[PDB]
Amino acid sequence: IKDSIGLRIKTERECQQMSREVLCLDGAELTVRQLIRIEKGESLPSLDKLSYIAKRLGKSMADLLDHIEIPDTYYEMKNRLIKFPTYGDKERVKQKLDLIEDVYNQFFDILPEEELLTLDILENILSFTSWEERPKVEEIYEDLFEQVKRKKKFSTNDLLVIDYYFYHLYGRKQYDKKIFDRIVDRVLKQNIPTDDAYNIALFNDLMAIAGLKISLESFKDFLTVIDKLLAVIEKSQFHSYKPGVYILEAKYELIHNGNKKKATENYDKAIMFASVLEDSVLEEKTRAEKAADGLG
C-alpha cells in the first residue's frame, strides 16, 4: 500500500502539472526530501502529510482514497453457490465444489475473514455424507459452536454452522434433546431481513429442523416451523423453494395425522411444481419419495 499511494500522489501531481517546488515555497511544512522519498514508496506517508497534499490538491482525502474493493464477479459465483439447490445430486454438488476451489483460486486474498468463513462451512455441508463417517460440529468448530448456543441474534455464518449441526444429527439417536430444542427456539425467533443469503441459510435450517423432527417422530411446534418457512418465502419471493414445504406437509399429514388423502395431494402439488420449474432431478426425486411412502 506504501508504494501504491505514493504512486497515486505522484501520478495525480503529474496530471495537475504541478511541480514539487510549487507545492512548498517555504518547504517548512513539507521538506522536498520527504515528498520525494514518499513518491519512491520507500517511506510510509504520515497522516499529516496526507492531509497537506490533499488540502493543496484541492481534493478531499476521502474521494480518491475511497477509490481495496471486492470485484462483482465474486458475487456472481457466490450467487451460483447458494441460489442453486442441488438436492444432494451427484453431479450438481461436484460442480459447486469445483466452483468453490475456483473461487479460492481467484479471490482468496481479497475476501473478509467472515466471507472465507462462509465459504468454508457450506463446503463441509456439500461434501457431507453421513454422521458416522464425518467429524462432529464441535470438533471442527469448538469456539464458534459454543458462541452460537448462547447468542441471541445469528448471522449468515451462524445459520450455516447450525445447519451443519443438523446434518450430523440426522438418523442419529443418543442425542442431547435440550441443546436441540434450545437452538430451534432461537432460530424461529430470528427476524427475517432483506438479505437473500441470510434467508437461504435460515431456510436450510428450517428444512433441516423439520427433517429431524419427522425422522425422530417429534412434532412440537411443527406448525410454527412451516409458518416461518412460508413467511420467508413470502418476503424473499423464493417460490422455487415452495415445493419443499409441500413435501414437509405431506410427510406430516401422513405420519402425524395418519392421513393419506391429504398426504397424496401434498406430494402431487410438489411434483407439479417440480415439473413447471423444469427441474428434472428435483421431480424424479420427490416423486420417488412418494412411492417410497407407499403412494402412487
Binding site: 440426522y170 433441516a208 419419495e289
Partner: peptide, 8 residues
C-alpha cells in the same frame, strides 16, 4: 440425510 434437506 434426505434430498430435500440440502437446499445448497
Amino acid at each position: 440425510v434426505p434430498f430435500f434437506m440440502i437446499y445448497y
